[PDB]
């Protein structure tokens, strides 16, 4: 259930785009700011985002994002209202959230409601473990009847003491799965994300203890990660650069899955190249293969290894540079890849860009 088609209106350098775009992995290039702004930038705003009003084009009173997959819409106006819409229905911004939040997936933007969340981080490890953590619940669960009933009444308090001594039994039995089977997770990873221009990436899933038992169990799950050799382990969320975020987010979302049907990574290629670079456009393919990627590029590699190929252009329109896209044919497209290493067709630059498309 892809996202099919996106309408943009009045935002930034857009006074009016309609896109069909569709697919596995599509790749945006030519004029890359102003990608972002469709794919990150107005994505974002379906996804019941920030009501950033610098979104709103310079000279015009309010904006509109459609987008169709079932629709969701997002208007802002100058005014400092707006209103969102699901399937045509005025509904409120939280419920676009919601709604949004199972279709599209920003990396880096909006890996907070996604991978980052508390709840998320611990999933990651109690899906590799559901015997232990099924086993937590239905402890958890049968004492809180036991509280239940205790509560509703000197008085015998026999059962609920036995409970919550199978609760902490169990729940004792879930840390040790996660330890357990914590190493081979982070293991896994790593693989990845050492290739993706970490080479000394460390992480760590960290256990840590409650002062009472949580409905998931006796222990925080937190996921902790250093890009570099010189430095501490931390959350994800302290990572010095977005791009470095996105590559460890593709990472995870290749290794594990991704859990909606669209996904956006801003800035994956930014501060690599090379061998670097190969390996997330490698990725970015695999990712592909199940999902739909929308990802902004400057780096040919990358480009190369999309399912379809978009140029953003620029166009005047009443005496203003606005911006414009349009599908890359195959010639087209690489010339494109041509252009993007040697910045203009050179005989071995068709002869780069053949390999790099194949």
């Not at 969340?117 to 669960?141: F, I, M, W």
């Not at 203009?344 to 390999?355: F, G, K, P, Q, V």
Request: aromatic share 4%.
């Amino acid at each position: 259930p892809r996202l099919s088609r996106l309408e943009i209106r009045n935002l930034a350098t857009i006074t009016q785009l309609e896109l069909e775009l569709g697919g596995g992995f599509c790749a945006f290039t030519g004029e890359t700011g102003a990608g972002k702004s469709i794919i990150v930038d107005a994505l974002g705003l379906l996804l019941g985002g920030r009501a950033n009003h610098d979104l709103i084009r310079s000279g015009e009173k309010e904006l509109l994002v459609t987008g169709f997959w079932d629709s969701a819409s997002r208007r802002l106006s100058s005014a400092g209202r707006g209103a969102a819409r699901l399937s045509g229905e005025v509904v409120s911004v939280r419920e676009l959230q919601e709604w949004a939040q199972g279709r599209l997936t920003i990396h880096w933007q909006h890996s907070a409601v996604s991978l980052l969340s508390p709840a998320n981080q611990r999933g990651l490890l109690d899906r590799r473990v559901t015997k232990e953590a099924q086993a937590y619940a239905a402890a958890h669960a049968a004492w809180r009847e036991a509280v239940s009933r205790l509560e509703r009444l000197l008085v015998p308090r026999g059962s609920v003491d036995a409970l919550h001594a199978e609760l902490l039994k169990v729940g004792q039995a879930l840390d040790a799965a996660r330890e357990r089977e914590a190493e081979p997770l982070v293991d896994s990873l790593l693989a990845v994300i050492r290739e993706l221009g970490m080479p000394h990436a460390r992480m760590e899933f960290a256990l840590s203890a409650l002062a009472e038992p949580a409905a998931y169990g006796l222990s925080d799950v937190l996921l902790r990660f250093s890009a570099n050799p010189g430095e501490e382990l931390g959350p994800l969320s302290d990572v010095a650069s977005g791009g470095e975020l996105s590559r460890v987010m593709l990472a995870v979302s290749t290794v594990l899955g991704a859990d909606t049907p669209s996904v956006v990574f801003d800035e994956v290629d930014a501060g690599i190249g090379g061998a670097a670079a190969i390996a997330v456009a490698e990725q970015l393919s695999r990712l592909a293969d199940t999902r739909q990627v929308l990802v902004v590029t400057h780096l040919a590699q990358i480009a190369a290894r999309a399912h379809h190929h978009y140029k953003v252009e620029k166009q005047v329109e009443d005496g203003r540079t606005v911006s414009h896209v349009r599908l890359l044919t195959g010639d087209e497209r690489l010339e494109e890849i041509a252009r993007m290493l040697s910045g203009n067709t050179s005989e071995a630059a068709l002869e780069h860009a053949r390999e790099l498309l194949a």
